[PDB]
Amino acid sequence: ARGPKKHLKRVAAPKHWMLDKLTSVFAPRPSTGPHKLRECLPLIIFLRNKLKYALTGDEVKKICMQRFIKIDGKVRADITYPAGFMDVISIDKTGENFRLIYDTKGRFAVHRITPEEAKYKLCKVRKIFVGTKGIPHLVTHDARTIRYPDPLIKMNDTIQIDLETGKITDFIKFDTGNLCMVTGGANLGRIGVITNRERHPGSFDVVHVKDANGNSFATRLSNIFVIGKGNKPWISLPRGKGIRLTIAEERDKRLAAKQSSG
Amino acid sequence: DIQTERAYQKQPTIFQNKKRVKLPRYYKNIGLGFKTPKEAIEGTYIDKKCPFTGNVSIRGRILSGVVTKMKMQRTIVIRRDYLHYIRKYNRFEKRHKNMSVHLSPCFRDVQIGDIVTVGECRPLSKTVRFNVLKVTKAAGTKK
Amino acid sequence: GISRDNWHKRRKTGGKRKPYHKKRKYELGRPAANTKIGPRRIHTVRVRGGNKKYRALRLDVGNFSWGSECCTRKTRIIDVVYNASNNELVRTKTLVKNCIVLIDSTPYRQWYESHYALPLGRKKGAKLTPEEEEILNKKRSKKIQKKYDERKKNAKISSLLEEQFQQGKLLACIASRPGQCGRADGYVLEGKELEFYLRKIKARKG
RNA sequence: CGCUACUACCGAUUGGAUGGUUUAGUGAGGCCCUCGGAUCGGCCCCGCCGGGGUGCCCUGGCGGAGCGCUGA
RNA sequence: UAAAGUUGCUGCAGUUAAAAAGCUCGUAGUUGGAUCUUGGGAGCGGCCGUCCCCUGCUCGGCGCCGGCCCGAAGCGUUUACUUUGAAAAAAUUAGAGUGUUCAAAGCAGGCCGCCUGGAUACCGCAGCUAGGAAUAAUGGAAUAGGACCGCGGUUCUAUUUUGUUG
RNA sequence: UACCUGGUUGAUCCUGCCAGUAGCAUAUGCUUGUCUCAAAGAUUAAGCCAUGCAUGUCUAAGUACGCACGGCCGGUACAGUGAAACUGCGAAUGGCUCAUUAAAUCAGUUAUGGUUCCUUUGGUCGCUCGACUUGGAUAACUGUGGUAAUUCUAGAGCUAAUACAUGCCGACGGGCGCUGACCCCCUUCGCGGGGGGGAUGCGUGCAUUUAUCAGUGGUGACUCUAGAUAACCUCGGGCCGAUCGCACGCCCGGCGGCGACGACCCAUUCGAACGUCUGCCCUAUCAACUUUCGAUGGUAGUCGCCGUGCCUACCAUGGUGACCACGGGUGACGGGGAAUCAGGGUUCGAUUCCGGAGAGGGAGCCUGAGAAACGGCUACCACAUCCAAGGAAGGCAGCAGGCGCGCAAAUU
């Protein structure tokens, strides 16, 4: 191509959207925004595939242009707006609030949060910058340039912003024994305490993470997010709790739940 | 001794015309735990493409090879021998890729056969993308 | 047009390439500025990304820096003397980066004579008849004459610059690219640099 | 050796036809630089009279030309 | 494409069926003899089988009266090999679930609003990572510019130190 | 399912091939009731194309005096529906094809500390110390036209801006660097020594460009980020808002909510570009090739968005090769993949996903964040269309469709 691409093919769409094969040639190409193309979940796919409030993508145009949807504290009217990790979708006329947390499989799930929980969100910082007059700058994983932050906050720490004001309230520092949601790679959706940092000058630093059933696993430090100091998370967690039961144990629990229920 | 070009040769950073009443030398640690040599700091040479006393940063790949030619000026040809696996004939074949690599004149005593470590950087010339980081001398050759 | 392509030319091995695509845009050459010494003519060029780039074609002044005591002034460029790259870009007086140009001294001589309060240049025998900078050499207060005296103690300039300030023309090294930024900024040659470039101008002379 | 048939081969013909690369000579057209200056202005000038202030001045509508200046 | 072990790595042939150069030397290529950690200390099960151990040198915590026990970052031959880990688009293939009426398909569906699914594997080589050290290469001390020792000296120099300022 | 079988002989055992055997994917023959999916002008000609269509677009919110429609509390302009036209944005995606292309493309793998980036998202947007809203064109409109002809346009009369231009007030009262009149206090017989206030003037924000000095935050490492000094400021000219809409209020004219649009710079996103390591088919009846029209280096420039022989000038004589360079061929776009397949393999991949390339052949450029764009423009070469013979117009390897080519492929 001799400029930017404006279409996304249904087949070339990321697997974690769980778009079917047969409905359309094209997938909703996420608009440019805070989250990456292959790490986001467009508003349309949340609004008509996950929750099924719409039937078509013209229904999603009617929902969003009534201004009933409010992603992380501000009303958007774009059907292909990239809503990503830790974002809070507040559908206000229904009186509902959803956090985009990764399920134990790599998808984003329908995680309903309370109106009090929906007022703050947790943001991993990407870099520390010194602005034009000695002004310290954070940049979060969702492109928030927050200036005059606490000096103890360094890269790979998470900060708790209040949506309404956009100012930091608390922060977890990247230290051992802290909870870690894995937000990239094979372990996408795991939750466990950080047990080891392994430095690599030049190459990528890897981080071993012990789980709530002693299931230790590694991950590239790029693909890591700290969700609470020690063993207490600062968010509410979906069922499975990022523990990742095996396919043999999944089969066992699904079979036990079906036979016992009736 | 030096400055045989038509233009004046100097380090760009260090300023050498301060009012008075030995010139100071710019160097740096290259990173990756590779020691800046003595001849880089104590020496009087001036090379824009030295990874210790020049405008070049080592990033990405660290490789090695054997110094095979030293006839180009300020740069050498190394030779990387490896084994490619043909899976039909469940065996290896001996294959080589010789690459032109820049040789910083802080490495004053380098002979052909010496196992040199090289660092990926920005392209210094048409065919050069690698600076020499350290030289380990050949098997024996203490004399 | 005139291309900046890596594909039009042979490989390490000496094997010619067959070109797989026609000249791209971003693989671009624009004709050389070859900026001269004359009344300021600078042509703005649109470049990649809708950003601007100022082709100086004539340029007669420049913000040159006297790095010894860290002063810089807008000074007239009068002559190109020496170019290390091409010997024929001296006859055709083309300003490029790392040119050796004669510039005016009078902004620096003015600064020196106002800051140090000592007669610099000024061939021995003559006076200043307007009596302006003659009064700016004299007539200070109690403690500020002491400030000028403490400054005067360590106010020695090199005999090389003393000669050049006397003729009214310093040697300067162009540091900016007048082809690119449209400016002819630089620094004044001193110490080993000045001795080097005076030796190269002397060798070219005969 | 002889008859029939087929297939390649050789070669007189400084053979012929589709191409491609190229020495040399010419070289459309764009682009850049450079000199351009058709044309269109706006300005200072005095010829003409007011409103107002007091012959002088701040100005409002009508034309002139040194093309005088500079602009596109 | 298999059949074709009639292209032969697995895996073919070469006395006579087609096939070993007339003979020798010879540089790349390919392949290369043997040899350098072993006997144990400890426990469980019924003499045997699995398990724990045979390198040292800034800051901390099971602490004790500057040291010892322990953890963390770093230093610690080079690979090849093997094992693990990270990472690697989907679609396809393998494959989990699911009565599209069956099936190819599909990614849906199922309960008198709710309950779920949209798994997982594989992804040659090369690059990254941490175990193992048999096998195969490779290294050293042989005019000793060999170690590990504490010593005598020299040159440059963080500055801890003279109530504060030379 | 790890499979063979007929054929040289009078008969025999062999070698060995021919022929059978089963897919698969192109053609074609004959036959064809139901139903569900579904390939389909790739192979030959990236050959030529009639005709139609395939990229346009308006919200409360840039610009409404078309009476084309249309309400009445109008004189404090503009009710509202609104064609056209200006402005903005898009037209660089999508679609098609596989000609070129053999370390190229592409794949895994890294880098960008070597670059650019409309948009989106979040920052910034009284940080500079020095008009209660400016200028005059132009289009639709109206009206005279010309040519045989085109999505050809010319002259004249008007009139809009978020078009093109120009530009102030406020914050604003003062800080901070020099300057430096003046003046104060202490020691000395005094000069001298030593320490504070200070009129005036010159500068000062971010961005651009150069030089210097010191060493807030960050990396494995910057000549990083930030700081300070000195300045510079492209007249073909960085920013600091002369913009629009909703509901409108409180306050002795000031002050304010919720937006839309625009904007320097930073980050983010979408990317794109150029590099790292490794990997490709046949060919030796291709063994030496590359190099003063750059070959491999070095130095300094030019150009470029940046890195670099990318291109100059001057030096150096290098670089690649039996581990197959260089040249040639390819019925070669590459990959994910497909067919067969015990274990190995063999063959194919024009074809819906990713990446690349091209629009009849080369070439050049405009505009824009993005093009060397062809449903953009300018030539040349080729072929071809209207013509009143002066000229004008072209690009189906888009969807249909036609001709041609063919063994070979569907509805204007």
**Domains plus CATH for chain A?**
1-116 (3.10.290.10), 121-171 (2.40.50.740), 174-244 (2.30.30.30)
Q: Looking at the structure, do residues C42 and C89 belong to the same domain, yes or no?
A: yes
CA distance A212 to A175: 18
Resolution (Å) of this entry: 3.2
CA distance B115 to B67: 7
CB neighbours (10 Å) of residue B94? 8
Evaluate whether A195 touches A210 at the Cβ level (below 8 Å): yes
Identify the burial level of A147 via C-beta atoms within 10 angstroms of its C-beta, where 0-12 means exposed, 13-18 middle and 19 or more buried: exposed
The distance from CA A40 to its chain's CA centroid, rounded to whole angstroms, is: 8
Q: Looking at the structure, do residues C77 and C90 belong to the same domain, yes or no?
A: yes
The verdict on B32 touching A (C-beta cutoff 8 Å) is yes
Nearest nt (C1') from C175 Cα: F210
User: Which residues in A have their CB inside 8 Å of a CB on B?
Assistant: 201-202
Residues in chain A, total: 262
Residue type, C84: A
Distance from the C107 Cα atom to the nearest Cα atom in chain B, whole angstroms: 20
Nearest-by-Cβ selection for B8 from C68, C69, C193 = C193
Q: What is the layout of strands, in order, in the sheet containing A167-172?
A: A136-140, A120-130, A158-162, A167-172
Q: Dihedral, CA atoms, A213, A218, A224, A228, nearest 10 degrees? A: 30
CA distance A166 to A35: 17
Q: Looking at the structure, do residues C55 and C98 belong to the same domain, yes or no?
A: yes
Give residues 64 to 103 of B whose Cβ lies within 8 Å of C.
Answer: 100
Evaluate whether A131 touches A114 at the Cβ level (below 8 Å): no
Evaluate whether B77 touches B89 at the Cβ level (below 8 Å): no
Q: Looking at the structure, do residues C48 and C93 belong to the same domain, yes or no?
A: yes
Sorted by sequence, the CB contacts under 8 Å of residue C107 that are 6+ apart come out as C73, C74, C75
Q: Looking at the structure, do residues C44 and C77 belong to the same domain, yes or no?
A: yes
Per-residue CB contacts under 7 A with strand E, chain A residues 3-62: 11-15, 18, 20-23, 49-50
* Chain B CB contacts of C190 below 8 Å: 17
Evaluate whether A87 touches A99 at the Cβ level (below 8 Å): yes
The residue range of the domain holding B70 is 1-143
Q: Dihedral, CA atoms, B118, B119, B122, B128, nearest 10 degrees? A: 10
Q: Looking at the structure, do residues C8 and C46 belong to the same domain, yes or no?
A: no
Q: Looking at the structure, do residues C134 and C191 belong to the same domain, yes or no?
A: no
Listed residue (A71, A67, A25, A27) closest to A45, CA to CA: A27
Residues in chain C, total: 206
The verdict on B10 touching C (C-beta cutoff 8 Å) is yes
CA distance C10 to C16: 5
Sign of the four-CA dihedral A142, A148, A152, A154: positive
Residue type, B63: L
Neighbouring-strand partners of residue A41: A83
Q: Looking at the structure, do residues C35 and C99 belong to the same domain, yes or no?
A: yes
| 3-state SS assignment for residue C133 | coil
CB neighbours (10 Å) of residue A148? 12
DSSP H helical segments within A3-154, as ranges?
A: 43-45, 57-64
Locus of tokens 């080891």: A196
Locus of tokens 């090289």: B118
Q: Looking at the structure, do residues C139 and C74 belong to the same domain, yes or no?
A: no
C55 touches strand D (CB under 7 A): yes
The residue range of the domain holding C135 is 106-168
Sorted by sequence, the CB contacts under 8 Å of residue A38 that are 6+ apart come out as A14
Domain total in chain B:
1
CA distance C196 to A83: 64
Q: Looking at the structure, do residues C120 and C144 belong to the same domain, yes or no?
A: yes
Q: Pairing state of beta strands C61-66 and C186-188?
A: parallel
Q: Looking at the structure, do residues C99 and C181 belong to the same domain, yes or no?
A: yes
Backbone angles phi, psi at C11, to 5 degrees: -90, 180
Beta strands (DSSP E) in chain C are 41-47, 51-58, 61-66, 71-83, 99-104, 169-174, 186-188
CATH number at residue C131: 1.10.168.20
CA distance A143 to A195: 29
Domain total in chain C:
3
